[PDB]
Write a protein that binds this ligand. Sequence first.
Ligand code: NA
Length: 121
Amino acid sequence: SMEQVAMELRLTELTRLLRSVLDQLQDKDPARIFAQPVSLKEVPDYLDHIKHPMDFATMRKRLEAQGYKNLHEFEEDFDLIIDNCMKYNARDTVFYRAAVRLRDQGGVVLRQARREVDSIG
Ligand code: NA
């Protein structure tokens, strides 16, 4: 049906916008601390600590399958990246501090993303 097609075009345009958001967030991580999953070969104890690992590559896979239905879902995964790092790593570490700086800088990007999603529909 045409109504199904129109819903599919909307998901496609959300996907486009979330790709630009994902790129902008990821530029805020020039060290590439959050680029890839934590390897269970190098942090064997990770999944004892962190129940829902997340990283930018994982998000990009989901996005490319149009797997985010709304901005809230995308934000959930971005918050996992930050919040997982802030739990596993101590305050005095480069990892924790990188997560704080990503959260702060990413707030800007997500604030306008929300306005664009609401405005375009
Ligand atoms: Na901790």
